[PDB]
Amino acid sequence: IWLKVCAASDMQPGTIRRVNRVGAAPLAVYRVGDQFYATEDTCTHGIASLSEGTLDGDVIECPFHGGAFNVCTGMPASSPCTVPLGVFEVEVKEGEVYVAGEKK
Ligand code: FES
Ligand SMILES: [Fe+3]
Ligand SMILES: [S]
């Protein structure tokens, strides 16, 4: 199940895009350089949107507590985060960014 995100050219490096899913929590797609990554958009430490946070390199900083995760692995990058984010495969076909609707 692949969800159409947007045209690669529509995402500037260092930006984030929220992607809604049917019957599930939304995802966040991050563009690091020319690479694209995706994780659950919701922080595992609280009800917070990571796409509303700060992407520093390939680490997304949560809007709260100073928490952070690596967007490639979904692993916590800073306290108080301890639970890894689910990661989702991203693929670019003909300039269009697609994200898997199912975790990997
Ligand atoms: S809600 Fe995100 S680190 Fe606490
Ligand atoms: Fe905002
Ligand atoms: S935003």
Side-chain angles (χ1 to χ4, degrees), residues 1 3 17-29 38-44 46-51 85-88 99-103:
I1 299 70
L3 302 173
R17 287 266 191 167
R18 168 210 292 166
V19 177
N20 296 292
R21 293 186 296 170
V22 177
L27 303 180
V29 173
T39 68
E40 303 176 293
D41 179 65
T42 313
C43 182
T44 60
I47 305 301
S49 174
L50 296 177
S51 54
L85 289 164
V87 298
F88 299 70
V99 60
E102 301 66 59
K103 184 189 300 180

Side-chain angles (χ1 to χ4, degrees), residues 42-50 61-69 78-81:
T42 313
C43 182
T44 60
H45 180 251
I47 305 301
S49 174
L50 296 177
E61 300 177 61
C62 179
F64 308 106
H65 313 129
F69 304 82
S78 186
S79 178
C81 301

Side-chain angles (χ1 to χ4, degrees), residues 46-101:
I47 305 301
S49 174
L50 296 177
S51 54
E52 284 288 352
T54 306
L55 181 61
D56 189 315
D58 58 357
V59 166
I60 180 66
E61 300 177 61
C62 179
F64 308 106
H65 313 129
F69 304 82
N70 176 283
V71 302
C72 313
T73 67
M75 297 296 288
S78 186
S79 178
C81 301
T82 54
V83 178
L85 289 164
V87 298
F88 299 70
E89 169 180 46
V90 179
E91 218 63 57
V92 184
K93 296 194 302 177
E94 300 178 298
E96 189 61 32
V97 181
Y98 297 80
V99 60

